[PDB]
Amino acid sequence: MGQVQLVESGGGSVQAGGSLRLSCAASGDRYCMAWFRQAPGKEREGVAFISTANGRTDYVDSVKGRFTISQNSAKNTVYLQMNSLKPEDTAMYYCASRGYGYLSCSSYNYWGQGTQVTV
Amino acid sequence: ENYRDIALAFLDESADSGTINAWVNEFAYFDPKRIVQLVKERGTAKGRDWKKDVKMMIVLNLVRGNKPEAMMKKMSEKGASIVANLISVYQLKEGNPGRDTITLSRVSAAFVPWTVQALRVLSESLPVSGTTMDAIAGVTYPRAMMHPSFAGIIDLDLPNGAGATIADAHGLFMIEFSKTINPSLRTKQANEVAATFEKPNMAAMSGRFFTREDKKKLLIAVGIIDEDLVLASAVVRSAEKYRAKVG
């Protein structure tokens, strides 16, 4: 039982060059939302994030331009539009909402269960 | 092996003054309630108007810093005699505080409800003048925000993120304050200076010495928010000019 609970969705198997949409439903709480991924064997890395006020958004260098993070402030949900998927994008994707206002790129807090995509 | 010879070899090992002082700066020390009790108890035990002394220790901390022994060497005998008095009765120290240590910075922090009203009068006499902050932000920067102790009255849990907006607006001053007192940070970027203070400044905002309702009334009286919790225009514009420096 946690003050904040995250549930990711939308993960699946997609051929190279395709595109799928991840959604994350938040519950319990204003924060900067970040998508992380961890390929099997490798370390978990940051993919995307958007600021609290929705003005600033930033993506990691490998997926910049290809991925698009957004949120519906009404439905309290975060989306991760991933286009032009590559075999290297095969990983389990997670969501986070660490710290509070001041910085923008915290590292490693509440997490979801994650969702797996395979390319 | 012989262990006496092992410990003896430390006589012939570097006691570098530069590296030693670097290790002690990182292993650094907070405490609001006990600072108030120690000031009142030691002030009345010496039969002083400790209330008046708190006001003087606050104003002295705002205009000269946290090194009482150092500022006393560049001050008139009139002021230097009052400094020596307050150092004796309250056992003031130069920084790096302990559990029962009283510093000029900790006095301004624990007694911040008066610091926030002295900022209304001292904006032009601070290390970073109020007109300078009026130039960094596109408006008249709230005088209530021109000292780190203001973070002790910031409720991040205020609705619509205004507590985080006030924090962001406060940070626009914090970066320039840190650049002035630490010359090595004057060549760093805005986000590099931000990461240097957001940890102890955060612990102040998350402090529970004041309740959410106390900080709420505190911001209303000084003009950051109103009874309807509406931020002043100077706050939101300073926050978005802070988020622009970090983003």
CB contact under 8 A, A52 and B246: no
State the amino acid at position B173 in one-letter form.
Answer: F
Residues of A in contact with B154 (CB under 8 A): none
Rounded to whole angstroms, the Cα distance separating B206 from B237 reads 24
**Rounded (10°) CA dihedral B12, B17, B21, B22:** -80
Please give the DSSP secondary-structure letter assigned to residue A43.
P
Q: Give φ, ψ of A8 to 5 degrees.
A: -90, 155
Provide the terminal-to-terminal Cα distance of chain B, rounded to the nearest Å. Answer: 58
In sequence order, the 6+-apart residues with CB closer than 8 A to the CB of A48 are A34, A35, A57, A58, A59, A60, A63, A67, A68, A69, A80
Rounded to whole angstroms, the Cα distance separating B150 from A107 reads 27
Residue whose entry in the numeric block shows the structure tokens 């009765």: B89
Closest CA to A52 of B106, B162, B85: B162
Domains of chain A: 5-99 (2.60.40.10)
Rounded to whole angstroms, the Cα distance separating A44 from A4 reads 21
Q: Give φ, ψ of A62 to 5 degrees.
A: -70, -35
Method of determination is X-ray
Structural resolution in Å: 3.8
CB contact under 8 A, A100 and B195: no
CB contact under 8 A, B165 and A56: no
**Residue-by-residue DSSP string for chain B:** --SHHHHHGGGGS---HHHHHHHHHHS----SHHHHHHHHHHHHHTT--HHHHHHHHHHHHHHH-S-HHHHGGGS-HHHHHHHHHHHHHHTEESSS--SS-EEHHHHHHHTHHHHHHHHHHHGGGSSS-HHHHHHHSSS---GGGSSGGGGGG--TTSGGGHHHHHHHHHHHHHHHHHHHH-GGGTTS-HHHHHHHHTTHHHHHHT--SS-HHHHHHHHHHHTSB-TT-PBPHHHHHHHHHHHHHH-
In sequence order, the 6+-apart residues with CB closer than 8 A to the CB of A46 are A34, A35, A36, A60, A105, A107
Neighbours of B155 (CB within 10 A): 22
